[PDB]
Write a protein that binds this ligand. Sequence first.
Ligand code: A1ADA
Ligand code: A1ADA
Ligand code: CL
Ligand code: CL
Lengths: 4, 4, 123, 123
Amino acid sequence: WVIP
Amino acid sequence: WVIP
Amino acid sequence: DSCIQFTRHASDVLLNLNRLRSRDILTDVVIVVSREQFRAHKTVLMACSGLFYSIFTDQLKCNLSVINLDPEINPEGFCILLDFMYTSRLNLREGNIMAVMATAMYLQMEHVVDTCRKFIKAS
Amino acid sequence: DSCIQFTRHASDVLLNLNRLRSRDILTDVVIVVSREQFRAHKTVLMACSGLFYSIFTDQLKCNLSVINLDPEINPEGFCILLDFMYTSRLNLREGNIMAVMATAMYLQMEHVVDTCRKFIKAS
Ligand SMILES: CN(C)c1ncc(Cl)c(Nc2ccc3c(c2)CC(=O)N3)n1
Ligand SMILES: CN(C)c1ncc(Cl)c(Nc2ccc3c(c2)CC(=O)N3)n1
Ligand SMILES: [Cl-]
Ligand SMILES: [Cl-]
């Protein structure tokens, strides 16, 4: 999971 | 396009 | 093999599937969650959820145009997860995380359940 | 928004859609190319091809279970492109590049046409  |  | 690969292809496919969903093009099922109705593509639901995968591989249920979820399922939690299925983006907030985790456990969306558990453990 | 994103989600969706195709699950159309028949999902074809997008948004053609392509279309070129649609992987070889480019131009798959033009220019 990432900060888009 | 890339070499997978 | 000796194949070449287009990096953005999967993301571009998903973006177009979401565009079809938003215009209600070739949607073949309505998911009923309490009073709320959500139109979707059976194939996308199966590709994202262990529960829908089991439902639509069933010789009888594969032909249903309406699927009613358990009354304990929260429509907002479902909406956030349906958006995630079509975008890869999860709108996880303090006010919805419990409903999102419970809906993801029911829908059998292992990666969402994992991030919800980690975010809850941090708080 | 304040969303989080799962990097592998789009790739995982496409992998599952290819698994459904390989088991012939929820395929709703057969594409006829000369003598050869290819089963697929209308939504995936639309998401990948400008030609299928135009065909299946047409109020009459959207309901067809069989689509016959132009007799000039090579079945092997189509097979390679159908595999690309479901995997992001293109089996481009010296012996098939002309048939692949011609099929991609007909199917309106802009990124494939671009890589074929570049590979041809290099040789
Ligand atoms: C497991 N399998 C062969 C398969 N083939 C095709 C599809 Cl569409 C599919 N989808 C599916 C099944 C289980 C799970 C998911 C998708 C997501 C998840 O967390 N569990 N799973
Ligand atoms: C252009 N548009 C709004 C849109 N919405 C939904 C879909 Cl499924 C779609 N697909 C499509 C159209 C044109 C092209 C492609 C897909 C690939 C391409 O090279 N040209 N295009
Ligand atoms: Cl997931
Ligand atoms: Cl393309």
